Every structure is written in C-alpha cells, then in structure tokens.
C-alpha cells in the first residue's frame, strides 16, 4: 500500500534532480509583464527550449540505471522524449496557481504569441486536461521520468533493459496516486492516458514551429538535433 524505504529514497532523488529546472514563476512573470511581438516570442521559445533540453539531459543522466544502457539507446530515449517533456513541463507551468485573472492573461498572451491557430486549441486542451488531474510536484517529476524511460520508442535495440528501469517508477507513481487521491481509483490510469495524448505533439511539432508567424525561423544547433528542423 504505502511506499517502502527504497521507494521513498527513489522519490526524493527524482524530486531533487527535477527541481533543478528553471522556476515556473520566472517564465510566467516574463509573459505577464509585457506583450511581445511574434518575433520576440519565437526567440523566447528557442532560448527556453534550449535551456530545457540541457537540464533534461542532466535529469536523464541521473535516472537510476540510465548510464548502464547502450549509448545508441540513450540517444534514442532522449531524442524520443524531449518534445513530450517540454509540453509536459509547459502544462505544469500553465497549471500553477496565480492571482485572480493572471492565468486568463497568460493564456491570451500565449494564444497571440505567433503560434498557428490549428496548434493553439489542442495545446490548451492538453494543458486544461492535465490541470483537472490536480497533479502534485512528485507526480510531474515521476511522469517526466516515465516519459523518458519509454521502452516503446522508435530505434530502441534493447526494449527490455528500458522496461526494467521504467517499472520501479511506474510502481512509485501508482502508490502515490492511491495516497494523494484515494477516492479516485482511476487517477493512475488517467495519468497514463495523458501520456498517449502527449505523443500527438511529436507528429506536428516541426510544422507547429515552422508555422510560427515570423519571417525567418532560426534555431540553435542543439534544437536542430532534438527537433525535426533546419
């Protein structure tokens, strides 16, 4: 039922590595402070995404057993998860509580950031669905770790080695869902279901970025490696 001493250790370890990310307040304060042009917002996005991938590699490297994996599989796992991890972190930031009216302005500013209309609606649909689950910081951290250690990514040679690293994280998350929400036994399944919705963002991410209302779409050499751009 309750977490074991080893599971408690694993959870705290994951939490500490996860907390090394850029604070949600930093991002929302910038967006809420003043309205930017689509050109300025494209550049804010690429700088945010470059910092996010850098921190995500550092978080991934600390995941227990990640270093024992085949080097080609390590690259396949990171490249297969980076976009989903960015959207999950964006969903976490979006659902953080702010003073009355602030989340409405934040949404309005993001809707008018330069992103094409067809990509706006499914993004906020996913963000608001994540929000209804009322996830704790521990649930976002474990779910990010579960996203990274997905054995069903394209080009994985040893899927069973990946399965073995993901299984203890799914077990901790399942126990946490039963503890945080004991009235809702569907909570764990709802979280896993949200991961299938996350995968849809991969298929159109490159198109989403190239459709941004700017004259030129400049990306950093690291973003070109993780994204299907330039």
């Amino acid at each position: 039922m309750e977490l074991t001493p080893d599971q408690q250790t694993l959870l705290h370890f994951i939490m500490d590595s996860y907390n090394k990310q850029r604070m949600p307040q930093e991002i929302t304060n910038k967006i809420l402070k003043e309205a930017f042009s689509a050109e300025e917002n494209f550049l804010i996005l690429t700088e945010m995404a470059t910092n996010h991938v850098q921190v995500l590699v550092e978080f991934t490297k600390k995941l227990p057993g990640f270093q024992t994996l085949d080097h080609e599989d390590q690259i396949a796992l990171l490249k297969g998860s980076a976009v989903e991890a960015m959207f999950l972190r964006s969903a976490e930031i979006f659902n953080k509580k702010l003073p009355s009216g602030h989340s409405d302005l934040l949404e309005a500013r993001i809707r008018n950031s330069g992103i094409s209309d067809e990509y706006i609606t499914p993004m906020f649909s996913f963000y608001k669905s994540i929000g209804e689950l009322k996830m704790t910081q521990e649930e976002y951290a474990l779910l990010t770790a579960i996203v990274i250690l997905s054995p069903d990514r394209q080009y994985i040679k040893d899927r069973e080695a990946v399965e073995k690293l993901q299984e203890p994280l799914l077990d901790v998350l399942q126990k946490l869902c039963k503890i945080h929400q004991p009235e809702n036994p569907q909570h764990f399944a709802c979280l896993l279901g949200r991961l299938t919705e996350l995968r849809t963002f991969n298929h159109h991410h490159a198109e989403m970025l190239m459709s941004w209302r700017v004259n030129d779409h400049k990306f950093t050499p690291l973003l070109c490696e993780i994204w299907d751009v330039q």
């Binding site: 590699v57 490297k61 080097h71 690259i75 990171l78 490696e225």
Partner: peptide
C-alpha cells in the same frame, strides 16, 4: 555523426 551535441552532453 548525427546527434553529436546530444552524444557530447550524454558523455
């Protein structure tokens, strides 16, 4: 080789 920066950050 492709993903040279990722391979670098990983190692």
């Amino acid at each position: 080789k492709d993903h040279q920066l990722l391979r670098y950050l990983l190692d």
